[PDB]
Design a protein around this ligand. Structure first.
Ligand SMILES: [Ca+2]
Ligand SMILES: [Ca+2]
Lengths: 20, 73
């Protein structure tokens, strides 16, 4: 029993790091 | 008073609704399984969808979909 797979990860907040 | 939570899914549902209607079904539900492509496909989709469409109507709209990501917390 799991149900979690990707769907969970990368679903907290949108972050974008610029090369700078 | 307001917080960042609805805006997150607001953009997800738009991209998730590949059918372009406003609701998600076994067809769109695959969008999440397509990322894994495991055995769960063509089976878990029928059981998983039960989570979204928890209204007993035959489809899930912008509302119950928010409960999906909720589990992430
Ligand atoms: Ca749809
Ligand atoms: Ca529903």
């Amino acid at each position: 029993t799991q149900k979690i797979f990707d769907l969970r990860g990368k679903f907290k907040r949108p972050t974008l790091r610029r090369v700078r | 008073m307001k917080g960042k939570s609805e805006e997150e899914l607001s953009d997800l549902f738009r991209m998730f609704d590949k059918n372009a209607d406003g609701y998600i079904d076994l067809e769109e539900l695959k969008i999440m399984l397509q990322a894994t492509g495991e055995t769960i496909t063509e089976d878990d989709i029928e059981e998983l969808m039960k989570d979204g469409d928890k209204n007993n109507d035959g489809r899930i709209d912008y509302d119950e979909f928010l409960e999906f990501m909720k589990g992430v917390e």
